[PDB]
Design a protein around this ligand. Structure first.
Ligand code: HEM
Length: 289
């Protein structure tokens, strides 16, 4: 099964920078969502969940086909709460109806990371909407109540190694958990991209508590929280080394995150030899907008 990228007809860098700007202006304007966190964190989670269905063994799932627009994937229990990200993007898609669904959902994640002062993430266009029958079944996204061995094994399906996994998990410095979405509650409610996930893991005094949904989570008196799969990164000696590396080197973390997140968003896609080079979008701030 091969998914060949095909550039939206006649479109070039300038077209996609217009779409980036539309998403970025809306992130700035619609600022009250989720108690003033804004939509940045949910758009990052959305880009990850539409990509995280990929299976390296048969090349099914992944961001290419934009299949989250179909009921089976939209209603996956693992995707509860992402409807808010979908509603945010819908008017953008109406304004630019030429962009494919996979391109829009993945570009939403790139725009959110950059506008939250994260690293630049190169991004390639040419995902093509595929039919409803290509939608992966539910149950490909990970559980949170597991240990390090589970996390490592899970991510082998997406062709990610230990450094890639620990870099990708740094996105958990953003946003919060919501009891009604996932059975977990709390978090720092942060909307600026930093390496604070690693600093908090190493520096806070974590307590294992049970929440109102009867699930265990790790809580600190500062108001931070970690899922069991987050805490597993300091229980496994290989993950722990890399957590310490990113707690001590913000630039290294930004560089490794950028590469792992681009790879996540591109898994399963074949880019022709004559495809355009990846784009690097300017932020609103760099444009003076
Ligand atoms: C073992 C892997 C992972 C598990 C089990 C996990 C699980 C979760 C859960 C349960 C939530 C809370 C959802 C809610 O209640 O609203 C969440 C939030 C989030 N996750 Fe993950 N996740 C994982 C990996 C990742 C990765 C790789 C990224 C992105 C690179 C990501 C980005 C996010 C973001 C940004 C949020 C906050 C969303 C918001 O504030 O609305 N996660 N995750």
């Amino acid at each position: 099964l091969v998914h060949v990228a095909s550039v939206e007809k006649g479109r070039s860098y300038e077209d996609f920078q217009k779409v980036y700007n539309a998403i970025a202006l809306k992130l700035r304007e619609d600022d009250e969502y989720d108690n003033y966190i804004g939509y940045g964190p949910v758009l990052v989670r959305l880009a990850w969940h539409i990509s995280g269905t990929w299976d390296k063994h048969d090349n099914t799932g992944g961001s290419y086909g934009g299949t989250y627009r179909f009921k089976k994937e939209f209603n996956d229990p693992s995707n509860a709460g992402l409807q808010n990200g979908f509603k945010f993007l819908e008017p953008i898609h109406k304004e630019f109806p030429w962009i494919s669904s996979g391109d829009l959902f993945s570009l939403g994640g790139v725009t959110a990371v950059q506008e939250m002062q994260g690293p630049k993430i190169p991004w390639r266009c040419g995902r093509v909407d595929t039919p409803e029958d290509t939608t992966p079944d539910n149950g490909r996204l990970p559980d949170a109540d597991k240990d390090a061995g589970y996390v490592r094994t899970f991510f082998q399906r997406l062709n990610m190694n230990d450094r890639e996994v620990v870099a990708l998990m740094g996105a958990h410095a953003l946003g919060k958990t919501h009891l009604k979405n996932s059975g977990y509650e709390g978090g720092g409610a942060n909307n600026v991209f930093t390496n604070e996930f690693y600093l908090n893991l190493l520096n806070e005094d974590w307590k294992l508590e049970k929440n109102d949904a009867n699930n265990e989570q790790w809580d600190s008196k500062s108001g931070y929280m970690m899922l069991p799969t987050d805490y597993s990164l300091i229980q496994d000696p290989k993950y722990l080394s890399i957590v310490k590396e990113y707690a001590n080197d913000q630039d290294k973390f930004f560089k490794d995150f950028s590469k792992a997140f681009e790879k996540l968003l591109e898994n399963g896609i074949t880019f022709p030899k004559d495809a355009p080079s990846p784009f690097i979008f300017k932020t609103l701030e760099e444009q003076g907008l």
